[PDB]
Coordinates of C-alpha atoms in Angstrom, one line a residue:
Chain A
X1 CA 8.8 -173.2 160.6
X2 CA 12.5 -171.8 159.2
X3 CA 10.3 -171.1 155.9
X4 CA 9.0 -167.8 157.3
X5 CA 12.3 -166.7 158.7
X6 CA 13.0 -167.2 155.0
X7 CA 10.4 -165.5 154.0
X8 CA 11.4 -162.1 155.5
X9 CA 15.2 -162.9 154.3
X10 CA 14.0 -163.0 150.6
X11 CA 11.8 -160.1 151.3
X12 CA 15.4 -158.1 152.9
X13 CA 17.0 -159.3 149.5
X14 CA 14.5 -158.0 148.0
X15 CA 13.9 -154.1 149.0
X16 CA 17.1 -152.8 148.8
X17 CA 16.3 -150.3 145.9
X18 CA 18.7 -147.6 145.5
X19 CA 21.7 -149.2 144.8
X20 CA 23.1 -148.0 141.1
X21 CA 23.6 -144.3 140.9
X22 CA 25.7 -144.6 137.9
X23 CA 25.5 -140.6 137.9
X24 CA 26.5 -140.3 140.5
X25 CA 29.9 -140.9 138.7
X26 CA 28.4 -137.9 136.4
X27 CA 27.5 -135.3 139.1
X28 CA 31.2 -137.0 140.5
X29 CA 32.1 -136.0 136.3
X30 CA 30.7 -132.2 136.6
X31 CA 32.9 -132.1 139.8
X32 CA 35.6 -132.8 138.3
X33 CA 35.2 -130.9 135.2
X34 CA 34.2 -127.6 137.2
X35 CA 37.0 -128.9 139.9
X36 CA 39.2 -129.3 137.1
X37 CA 38.2 -125.7 135.9
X38 CA 39.4 -124.7 139.7
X39 CA 42.8 -126.0 139.4
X40 CA 43.9 -123.9 136.4
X41 CA 41.8 -120.3 137.5
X42 CA 44.5 -118.6 139.3
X43 CA 46.4 -119.4 136.4
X44 CA 44.5 -117.4 134.0
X45 CA 45.3 -114.7 136.3
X46 CA 49.1 -115.7 136.8
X47 CA 49.7 -115.5 133.4
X48 CA 47.7 -112.0 132.7
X49 CA 50.0 -111.6 136.2
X50 CA 53.3 -111.0 135.1
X51 CA 52.6 -110.7 131.5
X52 CA 50.6 -107.5 132.8
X53 CA 53.6 -106.9 135.0
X54 CA 56.5 -107.0 132.1
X55 CA 57.7 -110.4 132.6
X56 CA 56.8 -113.4 130.6
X57 CA 55.4 -116.7 132.1
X58 CA 56.7 -120.1 132.3
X59 CA 54.8 -123.5 133.7
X60 CA 56.3 -125.0 137.1
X61 CA 57.6 -123.2 140.1
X62 CA 60.5 -121.6 141.5
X63 CA 61.5 -118.0 142.6
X64 CA 60.4 -115.6 139.9
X65 CA 63.0 -115.6 136.6
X66 CA 63.2 -111.9 137.7
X67 CA 66.1 -111.1 135.6
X68 CA 64.6 -113.2 132.8
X69 CA 61.5 -111.2 131.0
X70 CA 60.4 -114.6 132.8
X71 CA 57.9 -115.4 136.0
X72 CA 56.6 -119.0 137.2
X73 CA 53.4 -120.1 136.5
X74 CA 53.5 -120.9 140.0
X75 CA 51.6 -124.5 139.1
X76 CA 52.6 -128.5 138.9
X77 CA 51.2 -129.7 136.0
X78 CA 48.7 -132.5 138.1
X79 CA 48.4 -130.0 140.9
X80 CA 44.7 -131.6 140.2
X81 CA 45.3 -135.4 140.4
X82 CA 42.1 -135.3 138.2
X83 CA 45.4 -134.5 135.7
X84 CA 47.2 -131.8 134.1
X85 CA 48.0 -128.4 133.1
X86 CA 49.8 -127.7 130.5
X87 CA 51.3 -123.8 129.2
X88 CA 51.8 -123.3 125.5
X89 CA 53.2 -121.9 124.2
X90 CA 55.9 -122.2 127.4
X91 CA 56.8 -119.8 128.6
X92 CA 53.9 -117.5 128.5
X93 CA 55.0 -113.9 126.8
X94 CA 51.4 -113.3 125.9
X95 CA 52.1 -112.1 123.0
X96 CA 51.3 -115.0 122.3
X97 CA 47.3 -116.4 122.9
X98 CA 48.8 -118.1 125.6
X99 CA 47.0 -121.5 126.8
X100 CA 46.2 -123.8 130.0
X101 CA 45.1 -126.7 129.1
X102 CA 43.9 -129.3 132.4
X103 CA 43.6 -132.7 131.5
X104 CA 42.1 -135.0 133.1
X105 CA 44.1 -137.8 133.3
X106 CA 43.5 -139.4 136.7
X107 CA 39.5 -139.4 136.4
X108 CA 36.6 -141.6 136.3
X109 CA 35.4 -143.7 133.4
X110 CA 33.3 -140.7 132.5
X111 CA 35.9 -138.5 132.7
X112 CA 39.2 -140.5 131.4
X113 CA 40.6 -138.2 129.6
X114 CA 37.7 -134.9 129.1
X115 CA 40.5 -132.2 128.8
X116 CA 39.7 -128.9 129.7
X117 CA 41.8 -126.3 128.1
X118 CA 42.2 -122.6 128.7
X119 CA 43.5 -120.1 125.6
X120 CA 44.1 -116.2 126.1
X121 CA 43.8 -113.4 123.3
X122 CA 47.0 -111.7 123.3
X123 CA 45.5 -108.0 122.8
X124 CA 42.4 -109.2 124.8
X125 CA 43.4 -111.6 127.6
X126 CA 40.4 -113.8 127.8
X127 CA 40.6 -117.3 128.4
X128 CA 38.8 -119.6 125.5
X129 CA 38.0 -121.8 128.7
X130 CA 36.8 -124.9 127.5
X131 CA 36.2 -128.3 128.0
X132 CA 35.5 -131.6 125.9
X133 CA 32.5 -132.8 128.1
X134 CA 28.5 -133.7 127.4
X135 CA 25.6 -131.0 128.5
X136 CA 25.2 -134.0 131.4
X137 CA 28.9 -132.9 132.3
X138 CA 30.1 -129.5 131.7
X139 CA 32.2 -128.2 134.0
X140 CA 29.7 -125.0 134.7
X141 CA 31.3 -121.7 134.8
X142 CA 33.3 -121.5 131.8
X143 CA 32.3 -122.2 128.6
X144 CA 31.6 -126.0 127.9
Chain B
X49 CA 32.6 -149.5 143.5
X50 CA 35.6 -148.9 142.1
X51 CA 34.3 -148.1 138.5
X52 CA 32.7 -145.0 140.2
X53 CA 36.4 -144.3 141.6
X54 CA 38.4 -144.5 138.7
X55 CA 39.4 -147.9 138.9
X56 CA 38.2 -151.2 136.9
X57 CA 37.2 -154.3 138.3
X58 CA 38.4 -157.8 138.0
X59 CA 36.5 -161.5 139.2
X60 CA 38.6 -162.3 142.5
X61 CA 39.8 -161.2 145.2
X62 CA 43.1 -159.7 146.4
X63 CA 44.5 -156.1 147.5
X64 CA 43.5 -153.3 145.0
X65 CA 45.2 -153.6 141.6
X66 CA 45.5 -150.0 142.3
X67 CA 48.9 -149.1 140.0
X68 CA 46.5 -151.4 137.1
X69 CA 43.4 -149.1 136.6
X70 CA 41.9 -152.5 138.2
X71 CA 40.3 -153.7 141.4
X72 CA 38.9 -157.1 142.9
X73 CA 35.4 -157.8 142.3
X74 CA 36.5 -159.8 146.0
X75 CA 34.2 -162.4 144.9
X76 CA 35.0 -166.1 144.6
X77 CA 32.7 -167.2 141.9
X78 CA 31.2 -170.0 144.1
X79 CA 31.0 -167.8 147.2
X80 CA 27.4 -169.2 147.4
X81 CA 27.5 -173.2 146.6
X82 CA 24.1 -172.9 145.0
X83 CA 26.5 -172.3 142.0
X84 CA 29.1 -170.0 140.6
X85 CA 29.3 -166.2 139.3
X86 CA 30.8 -164.7 136.7
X87 CA 32.0 -161.5 135.7
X88 CA 31.8 -160.6 132.1
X89 CA 33.4 -158.6 130.7
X90 CA 36.3 -159.6 133.2
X91 CA 37.9 -157.0 134.4
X92 CA 34.9 -154.9 134.5
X93 CA 36.3 -151.5 133.0
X94 CA 32.6 -149.9 133.2
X95 CA 32.1 -148.4 129.9
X96 CA 31.2 -152.2 129.4
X97 CA 28.0 -153.3 130.2
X98 CA 29.1 -154.6 133.0
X99 CA 27.5 -158.4 133.6
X100 CA 27.2 -160.6 137.4
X101 CA 26.1 -164.3 136.1
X102 CA 25.2 -166.3 138.8
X103 CA 24.6 -169.9 137.8
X104 CA 22.5 -172.4 140.4
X105 CA 24.8 -175.1 139.8
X106 CA 25.3 -176.9 143.4
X107 CA 21.2 -176.7 143.8
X108 CA 17.9 -178.7 143.8
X109 CA 16.8 -180.6 140.7
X110 CA 14.3 -177.7 140.8
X111 CA 16.9 -174.7 140.2
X112 CA 19.7 -177.5 139.1
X113 CA 21.3 -174.6 136.8
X114 CA 18.5 -172.0 136.7
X115 CA 21.0 -168.9 136.2
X116 CA 20.3 -165.2 138.1
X117 CA 22.5 -163.0 136.1
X118 CA 22.4 -159.3 136.3
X119 CA 23.9 -156.5 133.7
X120 CA 24.5 -153.3 134.5
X121 CA 24.7 -149.9 131.9
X122 CA 27.6 -148.4 131.1
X123 CA 26.2 -145.1 131.7
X124 CA 23.2 -145.8 133.7
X125 CA 24.9 -149.1 135.5
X126 CA 21.4 -150.5 136.6
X127 CA 22.0 -153.7 136.4
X128 CA 19.6 -156.1 134.7
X129 CA 19.0 -158.6 137.9
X130 CA 16.9 -161.7 136.3
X131 CA 16.5 -165.1 136.8
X132 CA 15.8 -168.4 134.7
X133 CA 13.3 -169.6 136.8
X134 CA 9.0 -169.5 137.0
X135 CA 6.6 -167.3 138.6
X136 CA 6.6 -170.2 141.2
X137 CA 10.3 -170.0 141.8
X138 CA 11.2 -166.7 141.0
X139 CA 14.4 -164.7 143.0
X140 CA 11.6 -162.3 144.8
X141 CA 13.3 -159.1 145.0
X142 CA 14.8 -158.6 141.6
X143 CA 13.1 -158.9 138.3
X144 CA 12.2 -162.2 137.2
Chain C
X1 CA 10.3 -186.1 158.4
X2 CA 12.1 -183.3 159.9
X3 CA 15.2 -184.0 157.9
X4 CA 13.9 -182.3 155.1
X5 CA 12.9 -178.8 157.0
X6 CA 16.9 -179.3 157.9
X7 CA 17.5 -179.4 154.2
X8 CA 16.5 -176.1 153.9
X9 CA 18.4 -175.4 156.9
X10 CA 21.7 -177.0 156.0
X11 CA 21.0 -174.9 153.0
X12 CA 20.4 -171.4 154.3
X13 CA 23.7 -171.7 156.9
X14 CA 24.9 -172.3 152.9
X15 CA 23.8 -169.7 151.2
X16 CA 25.3 -166.6 153.1
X17 CA 27.8 -165.6 150.3
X18 CA 29.1 -161.9 150.9
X19 CA 30.2 -161.7 154.5
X20 CA 34.3 -161.2 155.1
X21 CA 34.6 -158.1 152.8
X22 CA 38.3 -157.4 154.4
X23 CA 39.3 -154.5 152.4
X24 CA 36.3 -153.0 153.2
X25 CA 38.3 -151.7 155.9
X26 CA 41.1 -151.0 152.8
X27 CA 38.2 -148.7 151.3
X28 CA 37.3 -147.1 155.2
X29 CA 41.6 -147.4 155.0
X30 CA 41.8 -144.8 151.7
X31 CA 38.5 -143.0 153.7
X32 CA 40.9 -143.1 156.7
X33 CA 43.6 -141.4 154.7
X34 CA 42.2 -138.7 152.4
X35 CA 40.0 -137.7 155.2
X36 CA 42.8 -138.1 157.5
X37 CA 43.8 -134.8 154.7
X38 CA 40.7 -133.5 154.9
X39 CA 42.0 -132.6 158.8
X40 CA 45.2 -131.3 157.6
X41 CA 44.3 -129.3 154.5
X42 CA 43.0 -125.6 155.8
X43 CA 46.2 -125.4 158.1
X44 CA 48.5 -125.4 154.8
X45 CA 46.0 -122.6 154.3
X46 CA 46.4 -121.6 157.7
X47 CA 50.5 -122.0 158.1
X48 CA 50.2 -119.6 154.8
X49 CA 47.7 -117.3 156.4
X50 CA 49.3 -115.8 159.2
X51 CA 53.0 -116.4 157.8
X52 CA 51.5 -114.7 154.6
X53 CA 50.4 -111.9 157.3
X54 CA 53.4 -111.1 158.9
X55 CA 52.6 -112.9 162.1
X56 CA 54.2 -116.4 163.2
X57 CA 51.5 -119.9 163.8
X58 CA 51.7 -121.9 167.3
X59 CA 50.0 -124.6 166.8
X60 CA 46.6 -124.8 169.5
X61 CA 44.2 -122.8 169.2
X62 CA 42.9 -118.9 171.1
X63 CA 42.9 -115.5 169.8
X64 CA 45.8 -114.0 167.4
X65 CA 49.2 -114.3 169.2
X66 CA 48.9 -110.9 167.7
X67 CA 51.3 -109.0 169.4
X68 CA 54.0 -112.0 169.4
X69 CA 54.3 -112.2 165.8
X70 CA 52.4 -115.3 166.1
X71 CA 49.0 -116.8 165.6
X72 CA 47.2 -119.8 166.6
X73 CA 47.1 -122.9 164.2
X74 CA 43.7 -123.4 165.2
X75 CA 43.5 -126.7 165.9
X76 CA 43.8 -129.4 168.4
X77 CA 45.9 -132.2 167.1
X78 CA 43.4 -134.5 167.6
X79 CA 40.9 -132.7 165.7
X80 CA 40.9 -135.8 163.5
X81 CA 40.4 -138.9 166.0
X82 CA 41.9 -140.6 163.6
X83 CA 45.1 -139.5 165.7
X84 CA 47.1 -136.4 165.6
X85 CA 48.5 -133.1 163.9
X86 CA 52.0 -132.0 164.9
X87 CA 53.4 -129.0 163.9
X88 CA 56.9 -128.3 162.8
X89 CA 58.7 -126.0 163.4
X90 CA 56.2 -124.8 166.1
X91 CA 55.1 -122.1 166.3
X92 CA 55.7 -122.3 162.6
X93 CA 57.7 -119.2 161.4
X94 CA 57.4 -119.9 157.7
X95 CA 60.8 -118.6 157.0
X96 CA 61.3 -122.8 158.3
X97 CA 59.8 -125.5 156.1
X98 CA 57.1 -125.9 158.1
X99 CA 55.9 -129.2 158.6
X100 CA 51.7 -130.9 159.3
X101 CA 52.2 -134.0 160.2
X102 CA 49.2 -136.3 160.2
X103 CA 48.8 -139.5 162.3
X104 CA 46.8 -142.2 162.4
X105 CA 46.8 -143.3 165.8
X106 CA 42.9 -144.0 166.5
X107 CA 42.7 -145.7 163.0
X108 CA 42.3 -149.2 162.0
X109 CA 44.5 -152.3 162.0
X110 CA 45.0 -151.4 158.4
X111 CA 46.3 -148.0 159.3
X112 CA 47.0 -148.4 163.0
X113 CA 49.7 -144.9 162.9
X114 CA 49.9 -144.9 159.0
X115 CA 51.1 -141.2 159.6
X116 CA 50.2 -138.3 156.7
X117 CA 52.9 -135.4 157.1
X118 CA 53.3 -132.5 155.2
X119 CA 55.8 -130.3 154.4
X120 CA 56.3 -126.4 153.0
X121 CA 58.9 -124.8 151.5
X122 CA 60.0 -120.9 153.0
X123 CA 60.0 -119.6 149.7
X124 CA 57.7 -121.4 147.8
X125 CA 55.1 -122.9 150.9
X126 CA 53.8 -126.1 148.7
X127 CA 53.0 -128.5 151.4
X128 CA 55.3 -132.0 150.5
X129 CA 51.2 -134.0 151.5
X130 CA 52.5 -137.8 152.0
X131 CA 51.5 -140.9 153.5
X132 CA 53.0 -143.7 154.5
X133 CA 50.2 -145.6 152.9
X134 CA 50.0 -148.6 150.3
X135 CA 49.0 -148.1 146.5
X136 CA 45.7 -149.9 148.1
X137 CA 45.2 -147.3 150.9
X138 CA 46.6 -144.0 149.5
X139 CA 45.3 -140.2 150.3
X140 CA 44.1 -140.1 147.0
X141 CA 44.5 -136.5 146.5
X142 CA 47.6 -135.4 148.3
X143 CA 51.0 -137.2 146.9
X144 CA 50.8 -141.3 148.3
Chain D
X49 CA 33.3 -156.7 163.3
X50 CA 35.9 -155.2 165.9
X51 CA 38.9 -155.6 164.0
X52 CA 36.7 -153.5 161.2
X53 CA 36.1 -150.8 163.8
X54 CA 40.2 -150.4 165.0
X55 CA 39.9 -153.0 167.7
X56 CA 40.8 -156.4 168.4
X57 CA 38.9 -159.6 169.2
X58 CA 39.0 -162.0 172.1
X59 CA 36.7 -164.7 172.7
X60 CA 33.8 -164.7 175.4
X61 CA 31.4 -162.2 176.0
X62 CA 31.1 -159.2 178.5
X63 CA 31.4 -155.8 177.1
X64 CA 33.7 -154.1 175.0
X65 CA 36.9 -154.3 175.9
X66 CA 36.7 -150.7 174.9
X67 CA 39.5 -149.0 176.4
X68 CA 41.7 -152.0 175.2
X69 CA 41.9 -152.0 171.8
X70 CA 39.9 -155.2 172.2
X71 CA 36.4 -156.6 171.8
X72 CA 34.9 -159.8 173.1
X73 CA 34.1 -162.7 170.6
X74 CA 30.7 -162.8 172.4
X75 CA 30.3 -166.1 172.3
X76 CA 31.1 -169.2 175.3
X77 CA 32.9 -172.1 173.3
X78 CA 30.2 -174.5 173.2
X79 CA 27.8 -172.4 172.4
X80 CA 26.7 -175.3 170.4
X81 CA 26.8 -178.5 172.4
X82 CA 28.3 -180.9 169.5
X83 CA 31.5 -179.4 171.1
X84 CA 33.6 -175.9 171.4
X85 CA 34.7 -173.2 169.4
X86 CA 38.7 -171.7 170.3
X87 CA 39.6 -168.5 168.7
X88 CA 43.4 -168.5 167.7
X89 CA 45.6 -166.3 168.3
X90 CA 43.3 -165.3 171.2
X91 CA 42.4 -162.1 171.2
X92 CA 42.1 -161.6 167.4
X93 CA 43.9 -159.1 166.3
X94 CA 43.2 -159.5 162.8
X95 CA 47.1 -158.3 161.1
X96 CA 46.9 -162.5 162.3
Chain E
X1 CA 26.1 -157.7 158.2
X2 CA 25.2 -154.4 158.3
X3 CA 27.1 -153.3 161.6
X4 CA 30.3 -153.2 159.4
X5 CA 28.2 -150.7 156.6
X6 CA 27.9 -148.4 160.0
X7 CA 31.6 -148.8 161.6
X8 CA 32.3 -146.6 158.2
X9 CA 29.4 -144.4 159.2
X10 CA 30.5 -144.0 162.3
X11 CA 33.9 -143.0 161.1
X12 CA 31.8 -141.1 158.4
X13 CA 30.4 -138.8 161.4
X14 CA 34.0 -138.7 163.0
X15 CA 36.5 -137.7 161.0
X16 CA 35.1 -133.9 160.0
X17 CA 38.3 -132.3 161.6
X18 CA 38.3 -128.5 160.7
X19 CA 34.8 -127.2 161.6
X20 CA 34.4 -124.4 163.6
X21 CA 36.6 -121.6 162.7
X22 CA 35.2 -119.4 164.7
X23 CA 38.0 -116.3 164.2
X24 CA 37.8 -116.4 160.7
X25 CA 34.9 -114.3 161.9
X26 CA 38.1 -112.2 163.0
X27 CA 40.0 -112.2 160.3
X28 CA 36.7 -111.2 159.0
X29 CA 37.0 -108.3 161.6
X30 CA 40.0 -107.7 160.0
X31 CA 38.5 -107.6 156.7
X32 CA 35.6 -105.4 158.2
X33 CA 37.8 -103.6 160.0
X34 CA 40.5 -102.1 157.1
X35 CA 38.5 -102.6 154.5
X36 CA 36.0 -100.2 156.9
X37 CA 39.0 -97.7 156.6
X38 CA 39.1 -98.5 152.9
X39 CA 35.7 -96.6 152.7
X40 CA 36.9 -93.3 154.1
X41 CA 40.2 -93.0 152.7
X42 CA 39.7 -90.3 149.6
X43 CA 37.2 -88.4 152.2
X44 CA 40.5 -87.7 154.2
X45 CA 41.7 -86.9 150.9
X46 CA 38.2 -84.8 150.2
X47 CA 38.4 -82.6 153.4
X48 CA 42.0 -81.8 152.6
Chain F
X1 CA 17.0 -164.3 163.7
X2 CA 17.9 -161.8 160.9
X3 CA 14.5 -159.8 163.1
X4 CA 17.3 -158.0 164.8
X5 CA 19.4 -157.4 162.0
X6 CA 16.4 -155.6 160.7
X7 CA 15.9 -153.4 163.9
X8 CA 19.3 -151.9 162.7
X9 CA 18.3 -151.2 159.8
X10 CA 15.2 -149.9 160.3
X11 CA 17.1 -147.3 162.8
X12 CA 19.5 -147.0 159.9
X13 CA 17.0 -145.6 157.8
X14 CA 15.9 -144.0 159.8
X15 CA 18.8 -141.5 161.9
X16 CA 19.5 -139.4 158.7
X17 CA 18.5 -135.9 160.2
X18 CA 19.9 -132.9 158.1
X19 CA 18.6 -133.8 154.4
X20 CA 16.4 -131.4 153.1
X21 CA 18.7 -127.8 153.6
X22 CA 16.7 -126.3 151.1
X23 CA 17.7 -122.2 151.9
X24 CA 21.5 -124.5 150.8
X25 CA 19.9 -122.9 148.2
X26 CA 18.8 -119.5 149.3
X27 CA 22.9 -119.2 151.2
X28 CA 23.6 -120.4 147.3
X29 CA 20.7 -118.0 146.3
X30 CA 22.8 -114.9 148.4
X31 CA 26.0 -116.0 146.6
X32 CA 24.2 -116.2 143.4
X33 CA 23.7 -112.7 143.8
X34 CA 26.1 -110.8 145.7
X35 CA 28.6 -112.8 143.5
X36 CA 26.1 -111.4 140.6
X37 CA 27.4 -107.8 141.9
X38 CA 30.9 -109.4 141.6
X39 CA 30.5 -109.4 137.7
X40 CA 29.8 -106.1 137.5
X41 CA 31.4 -104.6 139.8
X42 CA 34.7 -103.5 137.3
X43 CA 32.3 -102.2 135.1
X44 CA 31.0 -99.5 137.0
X45 CA 34.7 -98.4 137.4
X46 CA 34.9 -99.2 133.2
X47 CA 31.6 -96.8 132.5
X48 CA 33.4 -94.0 134.8
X49 CA 36.9 -95.9 133.6
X50 CA 36.5 -94.0 130.2
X51 CA 33.9 -91.7 130.5
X52 CA 36.2 -90.2 133.4
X53 CA 39.1 -90.0 130.0
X54 CA 36.8 -88.3 127.4
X55 CA 35.6 -91.1 126.3
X56 CA 32.0 -93.1 125.6
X57 CA 31.6 -96.9 126.5
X58 CA 30.5 -99.4 124.4
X59 CA 29.6 -102.8 126.2
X60 CA 31.4 -106.0 124.3
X61 CA 35.4 -106.3 124.2
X62 CA 37.8 -105.5 122.2
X63 CA 40.6 -102.8 121.7
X64 CA 39.3 -98.9 122.3
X65 CA 37.2 -97.8 120.4
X66 CA 40.4 -94.4 120.7
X67 CA 39.1 -93.1 117.3
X68 CA 35.4 -92.9 118.2
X69 CA 35.1 -91.3 121.5
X70 CA 33.8 -94.8 122.8
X71 CA 35.5 -97.6 124.9
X72 CA 34.5 -100.9 125.6
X73 CA 32.7 -101.6 128.2
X74 CA 35.6 -105.1 128.1
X75 CA 32.7 -107.7 129.1
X76 CA 30.9 -110.3 127.9
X77 CA 27.0 -109.8 129.0
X78 CA 27.2 -113.0 130.6
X79 CA 30.6 -113.4 131.6
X80 CA 28.3 -114.6 135.0
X81 CA 26.8 -117.8 133.8
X82 CA 23.9 -116.8 136.2
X83 CA 22.7 -114.6 133.8
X84 CA 23.6 -111.2 131.1
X85 CA 24.7 -107.8 132.1
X86 CA 22.7 -105.4 129.7
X87 CA 24.8 -101.4 129.1
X88 CA 21.9 -99.4 129.0
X89 CA 22.4 -96.8 127.0
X90 CA 24.7 -98.6 124.7
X91 CA 27.2 -97.1 124.5
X92 CA 27.8 -95.5 127.3
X93 CA 28.3 -91.5 127.0
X94 CA 27.8 -90.7 130.7
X95 CA 26.3 -87.9 130.6
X96 CA 22.6 -90.1 130.2
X97 CA 22.5 -92.1 133.3
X98 CA 23.8 -95.0 132.2
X99 CA 23.2 -98.4 133.4
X100 CA 24.4 -101.9 133.9
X101 CA 21.9 -104.3 134.2
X102 CA 23.0 -107.5 135.6
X103 CA 19.9 -110.6 135.2
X104 CA 20.6 -113.8 137.0
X105 CA 19.1 -116.1 134.0
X106 CA 21.1 -119.2 134.5
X107 CA 20.1 -119.5 138.5
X108 CA 18.5 -121.8 140.7
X109 CA 14.7 -121.6 141.0
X110 CA 15.1 -119.3 143.4
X111 CA 16.9 -116.8 141.6
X112 CA 15.7 -117.9 138.7
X113 CA 15.6 -114.4 136.9
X114 CA 16.4 -112.0 139.9
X115 CA 17.8 -109.4 137.7
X116 CA 20.4 -106.6 139.9
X117 CA 20.9 -103.9 137.7
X118 CA 22.7 -100.6 138.8
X119 CA 22.1 -96.8 137.5
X120 CA 24.8 -94.2 137.3
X121 CA 24.4 -90.4 137.5
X122 CA 25.5 -88.3 135.0
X123 CA 26.9 -85.9 136.9
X124 CA 27.7 -88.0 140.0
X125 CA 28.2 -91.6 138.8
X126 CA 26.5 -93.2 141.9
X127 CA 25.5 -96.6 140.5
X128 CA 21.8 -97.2 141.5
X129 CA 23.0 -100.9 142.5
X130 CA 19.8 -102.9 143.1
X131 CA 18.6 -106.0 143.2
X132 CA 14.9 -107.8 142.9
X133 CA 15.7 -110.8 145.9
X134 CA 14.2 -111.4 148.8
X135 CA 15.6 -109.9 152.4
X136 CA 16.8 -114.1 152.8
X137 CA 18.5 -113.4 149.2
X138 CA 20.1 -110.4 148.9
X139 CA 23.5 -109.3 147.3
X140 CA 25.0 -108.0 150.7
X141 CA 27.4 -105.5 149.3
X142 CA 25.0 -103.1 147.3
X143 CA 21.4 -102.1 148.2
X144 CA 19.0 -104.3 148.2

């Protein structure tokens, strides 16, 4: 008589039908990549901030290096625990094509280190805001 | 679970291997005394097509070892949840 | 003849093989800790909100204390029923290293009071956003 | 169940001890007349 | 066994703890008022 | 006995009660339209920038066309990946009623190409800043 109680239970084991959503990890990946751009976007604005004043820009925080022809980026590299930012050259003198990495170190297996780096022009500033990811992954926003 | 976090997965239990890019499966292989589970590769890094055996060792003469193994895709995760049994026997649910 | 009907039933008792998932309670714990950060995160932004205006910040809600060099935090301490927030010093004048506790009072046995507190710098604002939890538990996001 | 909520667990039944950091086991020890159950420690705080 | 899956979900419903920021509408209001001055300020300068 | 375990599960399937928020896509649409104005708004200011100097304005970036009675708009048309800007006439000589399109190409199905274009007067400059969207969608800010 228990066989029928099990008939439902055989079913119950069966019915579950939306389990493995892997590329959940890959909209997660898009979140991690675009939101990896979120980490750096005011630092575009920061390189251009103090360079647009008359002042270079280091990576790190603090008061202004305001006797030093320098200012902070006002960032800790892993502000975003997906990974790390890296100013290049650091401090950004602006006449250099400054570069703002963002590595996706602390990331899923599907962005396990897919860097998103930015790079300005010295006279023209526009950050070459780019990614290492797949079209299914890209930071939508900046160029891929 | 843990691959979808950023963490690999071993077979066995315990606290998280949370300094280790690893987590338990949180299972003893013969959780089900019909037989045993086997993670493959173990620990599951996820970029591998992870496989979750279940052997039916401690089973009747009519399932005396008819394994039921699962295997995911690395990018697409869906467990190739399959069995060694006859149509009269099958695990109804996953594919046979 | 019933012995065989029981043979399945002996089995049926047996087969259940995923029961005690304890550290379910510990991803619950991670949820409770990170989502304990969710409770406070716009209050970072709030201490810095009115301090970044010219106005101090109390804990609690209400209209602005806008004749008072003060504003609310706009929070009830247990906005998150995992536990309670505590501004320190309250009202946050900003020139103090303001601190935003979050206690995990109303929490599981595995976060039964594991506080997550934040603390800014007066000149540099960045919340020392920290937790009392184990690596298996941590609020992923802020530092542990 | 209740440890996974935030609540300890006594042996016995009843409403939840839901102001008490406690819940029943929802069992009478000899639910099975083969003999008796015994929670230990009772109430189960789970950290035990 | 599903009860525990729900235990988190009961929590999940709970944890959201910064929802109703009304006087968001009132810094919005300050923005709308000061930035309502922004609309007119060169028209001071224009009358003059 | 399992039937009751399923009773909750039948419920659990049921209770989810805020799923299809479509016109989420339509505040997204408002965001995409107004924030489509954000893309162009300093280019109003740019057409008027160099025309208000004595210099025409091309679309694109670069140094000033400062031997050429010309300047850049200082924009790449899809600065905003919702779509593209288009100067018209390009280069903007100003005595023409200059026009600054913004197409919403890279947009949702509910703004899949709903352009937002601007057009100045030659003597009176004011950009006919307009949209193709529905009242539920409009770029709030400029006229619809």
